[PDB]
């Protein structure tokens, strides 16, 4: 969602919505509006290393960068790995990818899991919201699978509500009956219903068949479970049946995937491996935590004396387990590229500079590459964005949301594996409003969100 950051005398004062008809219209979510309080708390301001007692102590940039570069030169290939968090920009992602490639390491992972079988991240449309947010206004039936749009993508849910109110949109949900602020049809909780829809016994298959502009939306939260591949295959089967029966109405792009974190689409565009299973299969000896605060990988899953580097802006679950801490910039303190769930690339602007000794993330990675002798070609932001264009040229088109549809190839490639579904009801992580306020490191450091959580849990 487009926003205006209002600052004064070098301090962020408030966040206001910025009008964009296609994405957020005129509104922002409560978290978007009020979580900027966390930007002033628990911040990383200086490089830190471990002393003889094993405690974290301040040091200069040269010391920490040389300490990281020594281990980067000592190990190579499979022994080096990196994990990207949910608030990472494309510039830092591509810089980290290049740095690890110069070591001959391909284990660049994200905390969010997307199934790699079949096409995987090979075809972009396999992991995008192809209908787009605005396209919800042209739909007539929408089927939601294993997601809570109200809390995962509140403005997407607002668009669905607007279509429901003005276009008489029909909404059906497979999962736990969460409150969506509009009435819908609850098909059930078992994932097997998807197959029952794909087979054709469920009457909702007929409802989808008669539709002129049907929509199927699968959330990434449902992909976070072990049946992500099978659930994606079943949803692809439903969409394929819809196309084969109802025919090609044109460029409608029935299949859709709703993402929850800001960095996921850019990372998948840049070739990052979704999920962290590569790290579990081959544990590394030096691990880069680029804003990774999900707790997916701990020291227990790692070998003894694993060298962990944390680069970020907040002191949270990822920092205290690190050997070297590199203070980075938050999204309000850099000009950085983010790709939304639609596949649309957008860029932020600098509102304030990073506090203390914190620096721009891709600048940190480029300096580390120079200290380690594997110097990266780019020196300025324009050159890093040229590199991004070299890797994924859609990352420099700053408002484009159009793209090619490759549903057919991805659909046949999803019929190779035959993973089975478990009898586990689809339960989203956000069941109620109290689960919505605290999701990332910025929101966890906010007192406004803590007050909101206290108010919703007990009300006066």
């Amino acid at each position: 969602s487009n926003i205006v950051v209002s600052t004064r005398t070098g301090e962020v004062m408030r966040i206001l919505p910025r009008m964009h008809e296609d994405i957020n219209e005129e509104w922002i979510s409560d978290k978007t509006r009020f979580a900027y309080d966390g930007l002033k708390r628990q911040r990383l301001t200086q490089p830190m290393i471990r002393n003889e007692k094993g405690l974290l102590t301040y040091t200069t940039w040269e010391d920490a960068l040389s300490r990281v570069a020594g281990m980067l030169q000592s190990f190579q290939g499979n022994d080096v790995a990196a994990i990207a968090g949910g608030l990472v920009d494309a510039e830092a992602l591509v810089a980290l990818k290049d740095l690890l490639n110069r070591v001959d390491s391909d284990s660049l992972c994200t905390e969010e899991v997307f199934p790699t079988a079949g096409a995987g991240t090979d075809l972009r449309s396999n992991y995008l919201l192809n209908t787009t947010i605005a396209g919800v206004e042209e739909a007539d039936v929408i089927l939601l699978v294993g997601t809570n749009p109200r809390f995962e993508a509140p403005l997407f849910n607002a668009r669905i509500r607007k279509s429901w109110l003005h276009n008489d949109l029909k909404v059906a949900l497979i999962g736990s009956p969460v409150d969506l602020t509009y009435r819908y049809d609850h098909l059930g909780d078992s994932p097997k219903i998807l197959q029952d829809i794909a087979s054709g016994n469920h009457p909702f298959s007929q409802i989808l068949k008669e539709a002129k502009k049907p929509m199927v939306v699968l959330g990434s939260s449902a992909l976070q479970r072990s049946d992500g591949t099978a659930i994606l295959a079943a949803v692809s089967n439903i969409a394929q049946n819809i196309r084969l029966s109802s025919g090609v109405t044109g460029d409608w792009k029935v299949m859709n995937i709703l993402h929850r974190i800001a960095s996921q689409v850019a990372a998948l565009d840049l070739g990052y491996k979704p999920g962290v299973e590569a790290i579990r299969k081959n544990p590394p000896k030096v691990l880069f935590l680029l804003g990774a605060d999900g707790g997916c990988i701990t020291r227990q899953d790692l070998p003894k004396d694993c060298f962990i580097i944390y680069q970020g802006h907040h002191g949270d679950v990822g920092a205290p387990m690190a050997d070297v801490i590199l203070p980075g910039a938050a999204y309000t303190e850099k000009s950085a590229t983010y790709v939304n769930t639609e596949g649309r690339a957008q860029q932020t602007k600098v509102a304030v500079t990073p506090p203390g000794l914190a620096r721009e993330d891709w600048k940190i990675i480029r300096a580390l590459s120079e200290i380690a002798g594997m110097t990266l070609p780019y020196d300025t932001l324009d050159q890093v964005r040229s590199r991004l264009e070299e890797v994924s040229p859609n990352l420099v088109r700053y408002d484009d949301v159009e793209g090619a549809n490759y549903f057919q190839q991805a659909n046949e490639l999803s019929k190779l594996v035959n993973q089975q579904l478990l009898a586990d009801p689809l339960v989203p992580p956000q069941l109620t409003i109290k689960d919505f306020y605290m999701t990332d490191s910025i929101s966890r450091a906010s007192q406004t969100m803590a007050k909101c959580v206290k108010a919703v849990t007990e009300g006066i």
Binding site: N2, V4, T9, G10, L16, P17, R18, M19, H20, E21, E26, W164, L165, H166, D168, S335, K349, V350, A351, V352, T353, D382, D399
Partner: protein
């Protein structure tokens, strides 16, 4: 009486701007977004050129906000996008252009509030 010389205009050597405030700066050319606190649209008529934000720090005495870049307060107004682009190119500034956002026209209907069968029917007024 006329030279008829063919070359793009460049006045950087005549403006007196220091070298590192020409090539390192990145201007933004845009129509400013409407302040969402108000409904008036009179502030979204012209194009603006503004420079990139630089470091701001705290004065050790009085805790005031101190800066070191001379272009922190420079904003220019232009009638069209083309005029601003021409100004930036002739002044040697790298620029980013953002296309103007216009609120699309909408279908309003007071009677739709009292709908017989559609969901547009309101519960209170």
């Amino acid at each position: 009486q006329l030279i008829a010389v063919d070359e793009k205009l460049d006045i950087t050597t005549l403006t007196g701007v220091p070298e590192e405030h020409i090539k390192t700066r990145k201007v933004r050319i845009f129509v400013p977004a409407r302040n969402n606190m108000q409904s008036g649209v009179n502030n979204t008529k012209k194009w603006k050129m503004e420079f990139d934000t630089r470091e701001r720090w705290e004065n050790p005495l009085m805790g005031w906000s101190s800066t070191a870049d001379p272009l922190s307060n420079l904003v220019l107004t232009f009638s069209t996008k083309e005029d601003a682009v021409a100004f930036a190119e002739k002044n040697g500034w790298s620029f980013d252009v953002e296309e103007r956002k216009v609120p699309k026209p909408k279908s309003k209907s007071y009677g739709a509030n009292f709908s017989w069968n559609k969901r547009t029917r309101v519960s209170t007024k």
